[PDB]
């Protein structure tokens, strides 16, 4: 393994410089080493941009170079994006192939979401043939989503009976995603007044049924 | 597909094959098909293979009620006491799994499948099945129950492994449904729906159809089209005697279920006959018994044996030798008489 | 860029091996090699080694001996990472990288390959749509709920994979061994619920799919 370490976590702006910091860990940089530092798109997708100490991106933004900064990958990005949180990788490619270490992931400002979009319905009777119920209690793109989620059908909020879903961020901050109501069938006819009460950055989502 | 059983059973839609004596004589696709037989066994182990999920469930749990059925007539989950296993004999089990089933029976001249999943009682699906035991010991009774004796034999370990071989199928079940095609008048509809067409071209090659959809042909019936049931969802494995219309086929593999290992046998070999000394020989009078391989040795001497299968009295005079007579003879261990004045 | 079609999101048989393709289309890059990445749990790109293009070259790094294999099928632009030995302490990620600007440039897909054991059940999808009471705005939010998928995958298309602007979705999570999400979007007022904005849902290894078309309970 190896370590060219610098600031792992990373924090931007709108139009936000990433200084992509790795100082080597053993010392000094060169480009036989490859200290190189690549902006990465959504989902994990490391595309390496600012390529070993001599190169920039391919489409990019133009302030974005990896390159010699300390005695590692210093890696000056000046004019990101709004939504353009990626992890940017710091690769160390030692005259023969890109090895990584860390890579400091960066979220920054520009284009915050808002409360997560309800859609909160207990849903089609599938489920109470069954002998179940499974209402869809959620949101659609909060940001910042801190989500707070009652869930419990009959109204009040027990441990049981709720579920949530995965709430999914995407690149540009909307992070809204489902849950469940799921109890039984004539368990979900004995209460109807039902939801998944949700919050995310002052904006609250109704979950409620009607049954 | 063996961690779980059931992917190997979705991978095999099983069809029917060729029943040809099912009733008296009436031969088609029978769905209770004769595929393999599996007994190599010295654990007096009959195995039966065949084209129905008899130990596979329709999700693939293995539900003791539910022997799955399969034919053009869809598959279909039958009952799991109801698949008749007549040998000349009760079909007795060991167990099953999917296109297989292991048990001990004595056998006979026919063993029969007797299709009955719900769609009928019985249907006597057969097959000239050769099966004697043969069996291991001196002793000649097969009765596991009395404690007299322990030998070793080979019988089917009844584990639930993926496999051991794996037998399989592809080029796939271009299969026994014909009469598919709806009625134009010298056109013909197309009645798509149930499974693949397996069409073909006399008027138009939209008679070539493939499809769970329906189409139209004009001025060709039979006579001018072509219809035969040609689908998928089915790894076909063993399809004798009805041929696929692929020549060419990728085939797919599941196990073999009853893998065949080894075992003792609680063997009967009951106490002989009784032998007094005479004036210069000795006698056993064997009574009777189970067949036994009756074997009196003269044991270094030129070596005629007493020795054959017995079930009545007989008469065992070993005039014994300075080099002595064996009586090991039938189940239990030798007895070295040595002559004496 | 020479870019990845990935190799799917797999569960793990036991001490199984597979040549995991990331397709490195784009061109036939067989003087170009690669960096064969593999997608650590945490670290991100922490790459075993590298492929080739026509030499197929794998390096090698100090840990993916054992588990690791080098493919290269560079013939119509396929590199890819073999899972070789089945164990459940390896799933992670699987990508690729293509060597323009001489290191690693093509960044590729990324494919979740998860060891484990797993369910018998792959997921199912349904339909969950505007209600027989209302629930009846510019924003009529249905789709198709895609549950407990063991083992992998779990894909779902809205509008029937046709009308899917934007349906949000959860994708395969823990629950039992099986993965499990909802993917739900919305229609408009003339998005449904005649106009069928279906919520469909797959399961493509487990094979545990179905199309729920627009319409609601009323």
């Known amino acids: 393994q190896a370590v060219v370490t610098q600031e792992s976590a990373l924090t931007t702006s709108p139009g936000e410089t990433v200084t992509l910091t790795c100082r080597s860990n053993?010392?000094?940089?060169?480009?036989?080493?490859?200290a190189n530092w690549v902006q990465e798109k959504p989902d994990h997708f490391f595309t390496g941009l600012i390529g070993d100490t001599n190169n920039r991106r391919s489409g990019v933004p133009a302030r974005f170079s990896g390159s010699l900064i300390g005695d590692k990958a210093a890696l000056t990005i000046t004019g990101a994006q709004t939504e353009d949180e990626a992890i940017y990788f710091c690769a160390l490619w030692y005259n023969n192939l890109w090895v990584f270490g860390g890579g400091t992931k960066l979220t920054v400002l520009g284009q915050p979401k808002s409360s997560p979009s309800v859609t909160l319905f207990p849903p089609s009777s599938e489920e109470l043939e069954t002998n179940k119920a499974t209402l869809v209690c959620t949101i659609t793109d909060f940001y910042p989503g801190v989500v707070t989620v009652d869930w419990k059908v009959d109204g009040t909020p027990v441990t049981q009976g709720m579920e949530t879903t995965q709430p999914s961020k995407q690149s540009n901050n909307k992070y809204m995603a489902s849950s469940y109501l799921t109890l039984t069938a004539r368990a979900w006819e004995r209460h109807s007044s039902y939801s998944c009460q949700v919050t995310h950055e002052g904006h609250t989502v109704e979950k409620s049924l009607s049954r | 597909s063996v961690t779980e059983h059931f992917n190997v059973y979705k991978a095999t839609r099983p069809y029917l094959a060729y029943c040809a004596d099912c009733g008296d004589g009436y031969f088609c696709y029978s769905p209770v098909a004769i595929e393999k037989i599996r007994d190599e066994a010295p654990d007096g182990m009959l195995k039966i293979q065949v084209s129905a999920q008899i130990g596979l469930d329709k999700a693939g749990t293995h539900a003791h009620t539910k022997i799955r059925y399969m034919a053009g007539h869809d598959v279909q989950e039958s009952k799991r006491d109801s698949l008749r296993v007549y040998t000349s004999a009760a079909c007795s089990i060991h167990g099953t799994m999917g296109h297989f089933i292991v048990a001990h029976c004595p056998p006979g001249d026919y063993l029969k499948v007797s299709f009955e999943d719900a769609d009928s009682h019985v249907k006597a699906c057969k097959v000239q099945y050769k099966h004697d035991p043969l069996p291991v010991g001196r002793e000649k009774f097969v009765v596991r129950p009395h404690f007299g004796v322990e030998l070793p034999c080979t019988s089917y370990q009844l584990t639930t492994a993926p496999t051991d071989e794996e037998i399989d199928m592809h080029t796939p079940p271009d299969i026994p449904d014909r009469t598919l095609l709806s009625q134009t008048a010298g056109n013909v509809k197309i009645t798509a729906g149930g499974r693949t067409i397996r069409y073909n071209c006399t008027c138009g090659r939209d008679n070539v159809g493939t499809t769970s959809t329906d189409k139209t042909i004009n001025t060709c019936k039979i006579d001018q089209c072509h219809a035969a049931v040609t689908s998928h969802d089915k790894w076909q494995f063993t399809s004798p005697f009805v041929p696929r219309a692929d020549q060419t086929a990728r085939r797919g593999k599941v196990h073999v279920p009853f893998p065949l290992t080894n075992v003792t046998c609680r063997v009967p070999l009951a106490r002989a006959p009784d032998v007094t000394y005479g004036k210069k020989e000795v006698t056993l009078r064997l009574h009777p018994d189970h067949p036994t391989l009756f074997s009196y040795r003269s044991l270094g001497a030129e070596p005629h044996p007493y020795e054959e299968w017995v079930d009545k009295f007989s008469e065992r005079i070993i005039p014994v030798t300075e080099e002595g007579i064996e009586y090991q003879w039938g189940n239990n261990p030798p007895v070295r008489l040595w002559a004496q004045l | 860029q020479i870019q990845l079609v990935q190799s799917g999101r797999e569960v793990k048989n036991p001490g199984e091996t597979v040549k995991i393709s990331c397709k490195a289309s784009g061109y036939t890059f067989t003087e170009y090699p690669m960096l064969w990445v593999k997608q650590a749990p945490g670290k991100g790109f922490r790459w075993m080694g590298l492929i080739y293009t026509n030499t197929g070259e794998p390096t090698y790094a100090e840990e993916f001996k054992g588990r690791f294999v080098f493919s290269l099928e560079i013939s119509a632009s396929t590199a890819y990472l073999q899972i070789n030995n089945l164990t459940n302490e390896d799933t992670a990620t699987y990508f690729c990288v293509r060597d323009y600007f001489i290191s690693l440039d093509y960044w590729g897909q990324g494919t979740t390959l998860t060891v484990s054991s797993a369910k018998t059940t792959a997921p199912s999808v349904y339909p969950l749509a505007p209600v027989c009471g209302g629930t009846t705005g510019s924003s009529v939010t249905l789709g198709c709920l895609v549950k407990g998928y063991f083992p992998e995958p779990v894909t779902l298309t809205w509008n029937s994979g046709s009308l899917s602007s934007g349906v949000h979705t959860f994708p395969a999570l823990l629950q039992s061994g099986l993965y499990t999400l909802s993917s739900s979007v919305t229609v408009t007022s003339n998005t449904w619920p005649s106009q069928t904005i279906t919520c469909n849902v797959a399961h493509p290894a487990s094979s545990t799919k179905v199309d729920k078309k627009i319409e609601s309970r009323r």
């Open positions: 053993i010392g000094a940089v060169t480009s036989s080493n490859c």
